[PDB]
Amino acid sequence: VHLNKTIQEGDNPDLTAERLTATFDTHAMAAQIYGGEMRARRRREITAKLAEIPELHDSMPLPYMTREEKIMESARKLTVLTQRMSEIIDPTDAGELYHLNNEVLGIEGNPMALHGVMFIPALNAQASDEQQAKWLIRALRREIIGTYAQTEMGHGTNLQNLETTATYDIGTQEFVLHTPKITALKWWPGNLGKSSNYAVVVAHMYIKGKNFGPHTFMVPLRDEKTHKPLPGITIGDIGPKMAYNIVDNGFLGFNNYRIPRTNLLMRHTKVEADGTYIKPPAMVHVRSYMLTGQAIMLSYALNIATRYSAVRRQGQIDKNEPEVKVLEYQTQQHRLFPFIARAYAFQFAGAETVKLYERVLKEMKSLMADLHALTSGLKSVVTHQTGEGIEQARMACGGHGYSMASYISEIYGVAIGGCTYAGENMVMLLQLARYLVKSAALVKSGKASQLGPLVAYLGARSEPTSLIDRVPNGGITEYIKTFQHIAKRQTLKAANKFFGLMENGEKREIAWNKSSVELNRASRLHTRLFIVEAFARRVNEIGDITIKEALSDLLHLHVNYELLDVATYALEDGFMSSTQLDYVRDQLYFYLQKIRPNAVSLLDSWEFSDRELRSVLGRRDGHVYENLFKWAKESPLNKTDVLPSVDTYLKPMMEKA
Amino acid sequence: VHLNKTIQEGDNPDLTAERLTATFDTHAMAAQIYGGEMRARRRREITAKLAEIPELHDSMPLPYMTREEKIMESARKLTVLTQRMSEIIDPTDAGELYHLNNEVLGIEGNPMALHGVMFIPALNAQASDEQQAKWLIRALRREIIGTYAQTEMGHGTNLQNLETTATYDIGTQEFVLHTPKITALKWWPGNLGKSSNYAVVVAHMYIKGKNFGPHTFMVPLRDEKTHKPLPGITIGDIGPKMAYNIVDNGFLGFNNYRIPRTNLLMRHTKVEADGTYIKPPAMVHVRSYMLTGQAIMLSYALNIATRYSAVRRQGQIDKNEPEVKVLEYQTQQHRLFPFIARAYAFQFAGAETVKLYERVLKEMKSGNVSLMADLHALTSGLKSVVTHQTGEGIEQARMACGGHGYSMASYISEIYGVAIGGCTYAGENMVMLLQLARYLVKSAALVKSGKASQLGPLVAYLGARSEPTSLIDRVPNGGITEYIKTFQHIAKRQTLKAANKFFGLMENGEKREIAWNKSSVELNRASRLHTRLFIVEAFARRVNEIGDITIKEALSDLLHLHVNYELLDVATYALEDGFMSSTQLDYVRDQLYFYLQKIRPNAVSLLDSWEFSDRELRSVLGRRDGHVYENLFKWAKESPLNKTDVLPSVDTYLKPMMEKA
Ligand SMILES: Cc1cc2nc3c(=O)[nH]c(=O)nc-3n(C[C@H](O)[C@H](O)[C@H](O)COP(=O)(O)OP(=O)(O)OC[C@H]3O[C@@H](n4cnc5c(N)ncnc54)[C@H](O)[C@@H]3O)c2cc1C
Ligand SMILES: Cc1cc2nc3c(=O)[nH]c(=O)nc-3n(C[C@H](O)[C@H](O)[C@H](O)COP(=O)(O)OP(=O)(O)OC[C@H]3O[C@@H](n4cnc5c(N)ncnc54)[C@H](O)[C@@H]3O)c2cc1C
Ligand SMILES: Nc1ncnc2c1ncn2[C@@H]1O[C@H](COP(=O)(O)OP(=O)(O)OP(=O)(O)O)[C@@H](O)[C@H]1O
Numbered sequence A: 001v002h003l004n005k006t007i008q009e010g011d012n013p014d015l016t017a018e019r020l021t022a023t024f025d026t027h028a029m030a031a032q033i034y035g036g037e038m039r040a041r042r043r044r045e046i047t048a049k050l051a052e053i054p055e056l057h058d059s060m061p062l063p064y065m066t067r068e069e070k071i072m073e074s075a076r077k078l079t080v081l082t083q084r085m086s087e088i089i090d091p092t093d094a095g096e097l098y099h100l101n102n103e104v105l106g107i108e109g110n111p112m113a114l115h116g117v118m119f120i121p122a123l124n125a126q127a128s129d130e131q132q133a134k135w136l137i138r139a140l141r142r143e144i145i146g147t148y149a150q151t152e153m154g155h156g157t158n159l160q161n162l163e164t165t166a167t168y169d170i171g172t173q174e175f176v177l178h179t180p181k182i183t184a185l186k187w188w189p190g191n192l193g194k195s196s197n198y199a200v201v202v203a204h205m206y207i208k209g210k211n212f213g214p215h216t217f218m219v220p221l222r223d224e225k226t227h228k229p230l231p232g233i234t235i236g237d238i239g240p241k242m243a244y245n246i247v248d249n250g251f252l253g254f255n256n257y258r259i260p261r262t263n264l265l266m267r268h269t270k271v272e273a274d275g276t277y278i279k280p281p282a283m284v285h286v287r288s289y290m291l292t293g294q295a296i297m298l299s300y301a302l303n304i305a306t307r308y309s310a311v312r313r314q315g316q317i318d319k320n321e322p323e324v325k326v327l328e329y330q331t332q333q334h335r336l337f338p339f340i341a342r343a344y345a346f347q348f349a350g351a352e353t354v355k356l357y358e359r360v361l362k363e364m365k366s367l368m369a370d371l372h373a374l375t376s377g378l379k380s381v382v383t384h385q386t387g388e389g390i391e392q393a394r395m396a397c398g399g400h401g402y403s404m405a406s407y408i409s410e411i412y413g414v415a416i417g418g419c420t421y422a423g424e425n426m427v428m429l430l431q432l433a434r435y436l437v438k439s440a441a442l443v444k445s446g447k448a449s450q451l452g453p454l455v456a457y458l459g460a461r462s463e464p465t466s467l468i469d470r471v472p473n474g475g476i477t478e479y480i481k482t483f484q485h486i487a488k489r490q491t492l493k494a495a496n497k498f499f500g501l502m503e504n505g506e507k508r509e510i511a512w513n514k515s516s517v518e519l520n521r522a523s524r525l526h527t528r529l530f531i532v533e534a535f536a537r538r539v540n541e542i543g544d545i546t547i548k549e550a551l552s553d554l555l556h557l558h559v560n561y562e563l564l565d566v567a568t569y570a571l572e573d574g575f576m577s578s579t580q581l582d583y584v585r586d587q588l589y590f591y592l593q594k595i596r597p598n599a600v601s602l603l604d605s606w607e608f609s610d611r612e613l614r615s616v617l618g619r620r621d622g623h624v625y626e627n628l629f630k631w632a633k634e635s636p637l638n639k640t641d642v643l644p645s646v647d648t649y650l651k652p653m654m655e656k657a
Numbered sequence B: 001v002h003l004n005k006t007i008q009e010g011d012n013p014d015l016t017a018e019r020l021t022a023t024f025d026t027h028a029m030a031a032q033i034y035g036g037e038m039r040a041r042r043r044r045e046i047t048a049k050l051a052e053i054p055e056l057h058d059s060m061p062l063p064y065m066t067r068e069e070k071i072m073e074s075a076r077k078l079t080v081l082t083q084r085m086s087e088i089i090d091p092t093d094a095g096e097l098y099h100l101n102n103e104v105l106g107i108e109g110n111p112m113a114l115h116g117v118m119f120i121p122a123l124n125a126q127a128s129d130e131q132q133a134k135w136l137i138r139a140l141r142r143e144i145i146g147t148y149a150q151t152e153m154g155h156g157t158n159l160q161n162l163e164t165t166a167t168y169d170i171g172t173q174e175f176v177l178h179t180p181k182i183t184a185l186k187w188w189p190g191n192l193g194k195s196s197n198y199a200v201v202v203a204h205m206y207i208k209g210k211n212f213g214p215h216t217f218m219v220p221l222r223d224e225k226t227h228k229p230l231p232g233i234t235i236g237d238i239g240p241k242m243a244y245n246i247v248d249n250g251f252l253g254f255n256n257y258r259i260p261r262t263n264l265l266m267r268h269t270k271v272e273a274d275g276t277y278i279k280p281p282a283m284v285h286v287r288s289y290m291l292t293g294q295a296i297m298l299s300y301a302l303n304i305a306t307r308y309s310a311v312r313r314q315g316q317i318d319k320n321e322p323e324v325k326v327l328e329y330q331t332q333q334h335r336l337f338p339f340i341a342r343a344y345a346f347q348f349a350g351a352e353t354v355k356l357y358e359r360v361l362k363e364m365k366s367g368n369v370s371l372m373a374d375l376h377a378l379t380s381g382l383k384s385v386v387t388h389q390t391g392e393g394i395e396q397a398r399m400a401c402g403g404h405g406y407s408m409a410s411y412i413s414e415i416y417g418v419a420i421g422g423c424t425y426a427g428e429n430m431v432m433l434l435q436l437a438r439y440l441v442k443s444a445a446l447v448k449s450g451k452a453s454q455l456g457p458l459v460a461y462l463g464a465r466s467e468p469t470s471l472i473d474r475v476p477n478g479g480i481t482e483y484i485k486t487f488q489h490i491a492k493r494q495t496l497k498a499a500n501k502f503f504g505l506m507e508n509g510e511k512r513e514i515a516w517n518k519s520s521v522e523l524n525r526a527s528r529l530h531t532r533l534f535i536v537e538a539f540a541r542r543v544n545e546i547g548d549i550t551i552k553e554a555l556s557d558l559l560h561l562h563v564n565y566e567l568l569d570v571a572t573y574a575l576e577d578g579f580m581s582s583t584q585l586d587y588v589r590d591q592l593y594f595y596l597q598k599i600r601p602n603a604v605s606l607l608d609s610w611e612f613s614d615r616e617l618r619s620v621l622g623r624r625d626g627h628v629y630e631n632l633f634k635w636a637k638e639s640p641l642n643k644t645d646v647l648p649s650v651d652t653y654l655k656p657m658m659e660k661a
């Protein structure tokens, strides 16, 4: 058997050659990627089981379809999926369901996408025990379809200025929902337009004229039998989008729509029947769990671009040798491999974040602040660097990347949306910047010892100079220490600019605005430091020497590519020299060439079947050209030879001349 | 009147407020953008004329349509367009045709997009006088539909290894075109799949077994009356794409398809009837003229993002004042305004490039191809930097609209998909940057060997001597020259540094081409800096040509924002050798944030100065009048998925699924 477990007989030999050079077992790397040998094996067992159920396969290639056709296809697969789920899956294994959906439903959306991502989690986090019994069970059994309705046409970021109102009628004992203007329409909740018949709905709660602020409510939207909008409801789709068009993102409006008092979600907060209010002592779920989604989507795109790079030949290096694999050019390795490093790094960073999400929550029955800040920065950097890498992966396929035969353009449209959902990236970076400024005030005021673990480096003292290419035994610790220095220096520098403008008389919020770009520079460096450290932490946890060396090579590529990308900050104070920067450059180009024989195996280790990956250029077997010709020939515009546009128009136009 | 000529009564006052602060006449800035007052006025006159012809309007909003519906809509407008063109336009000055097409046909494509972009230019540049009479006239009159077929399924970059063959039969006096394998299929030529009935076709020419390399041929593809494929022709669409889906990009295959000898394009090469060859003494057209296309598409996206930023309120700065325009936050100004600077810079750089394209070509009747090399290298780098930085900016503009930007009501996502395609067409960006790098390495060998005086004007700075230190924030001068000199220093230093690494590996024994590959990433760093320097210098040159003081000050503010944003983005190269200090870099930072706030009251006018009507711009968020929310609610309500209340997906599937539980 081969160390690379994806080789099959008959595969394109140009691609097999790249798998044959693997130094590690791809099953063992999968276990690392997916958090356990068991987890990885279940992925493969699910994939092998779905191969025997053709009902759950793409009835035709998805890029052939109109929006209407895709929505029908998705619901077709979903009904079959919900019926047969237990034959394939442990429904309670949130991990198995995610993979099952990726193979069967894919990334473009489905009618119950929000049902899982937010509707159920909102019920877990905010409904009382009695209410969970009424609604959460019906949701889990898929008796109803639900979503989470927070954003409105005129507000998504702010929320203290939402316009939908829930006014408590003390007699009758109902909440009266009302949408006073068009801008108060709920707007963007996924699966709200056509699919959901219930929603959790954020609205400003009014009692005795007093505004208690945003609160969440269970709201029936459509009749459970005919699916018509209940009286007082205005509801529909918000139209087509950049991507993710299978989800029916919706608008929702209320004309004095009454719900029971008990529709207010009361695990935290109560409104008694007379009107009395009792105060208690997320959205954070989405940010914590979306990081794998981005890593995975980045890995989709790199699997395709790197596989295609092994089969695509183009140009000569040596004039007496044949055309080389484009994978041969340093320019091509340089535009792919740093992103393979990033995809592993994002995965490992996401595992630590999910652990921290579970660690708070557990402790919540003084660390939510640290989690909110980490997640704020990480969601913004990961999403932005993923987009950069996906698009580099598309363009690395040449002309054909622009075709939907690559599928990378759809991977891009869906992944990039995470720059805006779950918190605008600019806003989430400034959210982290507030935490970093608080931390900088601790340092400046002598309370350095009160810094939490994630931000203690801001209190540490820097050595004069950075010991890259100095201390014997080139270690990743001198790179970590260099990242720490530049992130601390920019954090304290940006903070002090802010403090200095207030000291000089400017209002807090105007000084904040004037320093906000600088402050986002700090957030970004602090977060990019976190990704490095998480990557290095995993490399050191591993005992299997072949796996450890493979990921260690990747880590070395990571720290040199990233440090070079931020070299400006290392040079400003002379922390780094010209000579150390040329060392980082030569190291970057060295580790490109080191990684190459493993590049395809490092991506095969994610173990995406063709039915998941949906790419012709990225076919597991490497037989691109023949299947690309078929895919073109079978596409909808080639049904007829001479188009209606040519008969109706165009031919008459030519005749007239 | 108002200095800003786009204000109309009834407009959203949040947006009007931003136009009222203009310091210059937007008609006068249009003249600067489009190269003359007359040209700019014609744009507006064309727009006013098209308002009286509703037949040429989007029959319904384009994002509502399937691919099939859009293609039908495009040909509908095209037929009307070709019949009524003379009523609106001077067909020969075009130019006006480019703008007419932008309003009527838009960016997503049309059946005759490549008819203009490449088919006709190929006939101008490569057909003899006799052949132009046969084919170019029919093309201009739109008697035929044509395209340019170079790329194949297996080769786009490496033309030397194309697989389609044209073998000369000496008897019969024909060329025999043949497609020996699937990978030899022509693949990607726009409008080839369904619309064109003729094409210019690049193929390796064989005579008596000898391969003379790529040559271009006029090739009839479909019957002029039935539009069926002529015998021996395999032809169709290559399928849907990231964007630009109205163009039917095609595949084309030949089974020993014979064309006359005289179908070889013979303005420069000849093949006589017996077989005799005779050697002569582009694609460069596309690269030269596509730069405005990118500038314009960048300006579309910024018009939308900045207009929407004036009407979108969100959050408080001062806690006792109402929610602010998002166009107030420094992060928002920082994510838009540098790209406004870039869009002007690309336009001005594109005008100088088109002048150089005309200046060679003009000189190519005499000697005199000793300037094609300078043009090819400039165009190689510029097409790569402009296209890549445009994409960065378009996407920043989309995300500056928040959630709604992701909707097609913004239209920026389509602007993005179409514009970014230019990172790959007309030369892969990585390949075109290395094409420039060859020219820079040749130039570095002149310097190293003492022939500095032989450097052409565009690359003479590589021979100049640098001062010790860069005089930004040191020495007053009337603005910008110390920034230019700093850009020159870092671009020269990286060029000579990357070149010497290449020379050093050969000196140590590596083969030329392996040393090249090993230095290629570094070499593209040089290309990029040299090109980004050119854009600065072109921008500064235009600022100094202008006499109208208000216009000059407005563009001067933009130029200052440009040089500080770009220099900061490349600061690594300025700091490495101590050319710049920490303190000068903090000056560049403070300058960047200053010029953001300086530019703001002009931001919306600088974009209105491009003078894109709503029918051109196609954005709900970007409406000239600023009435976003009401027209966004309508746009959603009228979209195709809201025709019915309960979807078929709910009746067929989904409702049964719920019942079963
Ligand atoms: C929207 C779009 C429209 C198009 N329209 C037309 C048309 O109308 N007519 C026509 O003929 N073609 C058309 N094309 C095709 C286009 O010309 C080619 O796709 C383009 O030239 C890229 O070449 P390629 O496809 O062979 O990419 P490839 O060369 O196959 O792959 C490029 C990758 O390999 C690398 N690479 C390749 N060669 C080298 C080298 N020497 N050195 C270093 N790296 C290298 C690059 O780094 C890049 O990452 C279109 C393409 C697109 C996307
Ligand atoms: C694919 C997609 C899916 C979505 N799914 C859901 C869903 O499922 N459920 C749901 O409830 N909502 C959903 N939304 C809406 C989403 O939550 C909001 O769009 C997102 O949170 C951003 O808020 P916004 O639209 O108001 O951005 P805006 O505030 O309108 O941003 C516009 C510009 O203003 C900037 N800006 C805003 N505030 C500040 C500030 N204080 N300081 C500096 N700059 C600022 C922003 O950085 C941005 O550049 C979705 C949106 C998208 C695109
Ligand atoms: N003109 C371009 N078109 C497409 N992609 C590009 C272009 N220039 C750079 N890239 C990509 O951006 C990534 C960064 O490469 P590189 O660091 O050499 O360029 P840069 O960061 O833009 O310049 P520098 O790092 O020298 O400031 C690479 O993946 C490269 O492929």
Ligand SMILES: Nc1ncnc2c1ncn2[C@@H]1O[C@H](COP(=O)(O)OP(=O)(O)OP(=O)(O)O)[C@@H](O)[C@H]1O
Pocket: A380, A381, A384, A419, A425, A426, A429, A517, A520, A521, A524, A565, A566, B334, B335, B336, B396
């Ligand atoms: N996390 C992010 N998500 C989306 N866009 C971003 C993000 N960070 C930066 N940008 C965009 O990149 C552009 C450049 O700004 P900036 O220089 O602050 O970012 P950067 O270059 O990545 O950071 P630095 O300059 O410190 O390396 C800005 O216009 C901004 O909109």
Ligand SMILES: [Mg+2]
Pocket: A564, A565
């Ligand atoms: Mg870089």
Ligand SMILES: [Mg+2]
Pocket: B568, B569
């Ligand atoms: Mg920057």
